């Protein structure tokens, strides 16, 4: 019996009008029916980038601008990338120390796998980008 129940997602209800259900204005949406206001599409600016465009029935989602990667749940914040073989410290991206490596454009350097301590031999030496490849005997 509620006249606003006839207004589905993508529209909003306002009984002061001839047409009870009105489309949500551009850059706004409603993810459920019966709303009497439209949610404004969220912004992806600064370090953020619009991953999924907002529609009349769904909000926009933000990933990070190129050169940055997501951190936290739902890409809450962004963190600057570094090249492979580097590490983001308090003094910027720095090359890994000799004996460590980083194979990703994020994270910290990690020590090379010590093949001797595991009873194996070195098949391929280590690199700032790549871990040591161990081999049997």
């Amino acid at each position, epitope marked *: 019996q509620d006249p*606003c129940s006839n207004c589905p997602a993508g529209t909003f*209800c*306002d009984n002061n009008r001839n047409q009870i259900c009105s489309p949500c*204005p551009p850059n706004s949406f409603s993810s459920a029916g*019966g*709303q009497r*206001t439209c949610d*404004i599409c969220r912004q992806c600016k600064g370090v953020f980038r619009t991953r999924k465009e907002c529609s009349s029935t769904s*909000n926009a989602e933000c990933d990070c601008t190129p050169g940055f990667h997501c951190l936290g749940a739902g890409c809450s914040m962004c963190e600057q990338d570094c090249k492979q073989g580097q590490e983001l410290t308090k003094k910027g991206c720095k090359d890994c120390c000799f004996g460590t490596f980083n194979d990703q454009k994020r994270g910290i350097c990690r020590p090379w796998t010590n093949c001797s301590l595991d009873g194996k031999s070195v098949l391929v030496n280590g690199t700032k980008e790549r871990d040591v490849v161990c081999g049997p005997s």
Partner: antibody
């Protein structure tokens, strides 16, 4: 009938977490937005943020991301949290109902917050 | 943010006078402006939305007009209960910003 009422502590020291509550009477939060506004003494109305029926929020940049707004639809409550309070955050805080696209058609009476040791 | 300025900051008018308060935006807001009334005890209510649409229950002596960057709120016949501060509010761009408000007092 439709009514909004703010609530929360009136005195907060500069160990700086402020928490307020906006209770709505005749307006479902899944159908309406809720906007927080504050008026410093001898000043005008200053909006703080809005939480939409879908749960997403938008905040004023001047608040330096110290303001967080959440809600519980089943309890008909909208929560306002603010950190890093200065004496500049002393004001009376309003919550208003966002209707149409867009206007504040229902206002609460306001709650006074004083930041002092 | 969009800057909202109201002229004058304070006004005193006789009863039955026609009152007009101005509200100007730093940029065009495409008639996305609301008017609010704050009574001296702190009560705030909506007067007009979309710059000319009277909210339900507001007396018919309130009216708004304007376009572009310049908008006004008109009281056709000033009444004793109209003693209040009046704020304009734009919703063209987030964050929504209020004007500085015009304080209205009544001569007698």
């Amino acid at each position: 009938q439709v009514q909004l009422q703010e609530s929360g502590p009136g005195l907060v020291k500069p160990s700086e977490t402020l928490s307020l509550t906006c209770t709505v009477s005749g307006s479902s939060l899944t159908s309406y937005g809720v906007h927080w506004v504050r008026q410093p003494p001898g000043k005008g109305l200053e909006g703080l943020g809005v939480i939409w029926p879908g749960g997403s929020t938008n905040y004023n940049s001047a608040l330096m991301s110290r303001v967080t707004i959440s809600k519980d639809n089943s309890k008909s409550q909208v929560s306002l949290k603010m950190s890093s309070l200065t004496a500049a955050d002393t004001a009376v805080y309003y919550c208003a109902r966002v209707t149409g696209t867009w206007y504040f058609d229902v206002w609460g009476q306001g709650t006074t917050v004083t930041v002092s040791s | 943010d969009i800057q909202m300025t109201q002229s004058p900051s304070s006004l005193s008018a006789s009863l039955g006078d026609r009152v007009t308060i101005s509200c100007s935006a730093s940029q065009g807001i495409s008639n996305y402006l609301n008017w609010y009334q704050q009574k001296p005890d702190g009560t705030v209510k909506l007067l007009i939305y979309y710059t000319s649409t009277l909210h339900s229950g507001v007396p018919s002596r309130f009216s708004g007009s304007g376009s572009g960057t310049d908008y006004t709120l008109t009281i056709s016949s000033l009444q004793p209960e109209d003693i209040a501060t009046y704020y304009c509010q734009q919703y063209s761009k987030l964050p929504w910003t209020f004007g500085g408000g015009t304080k209205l007092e009544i001569k007698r």
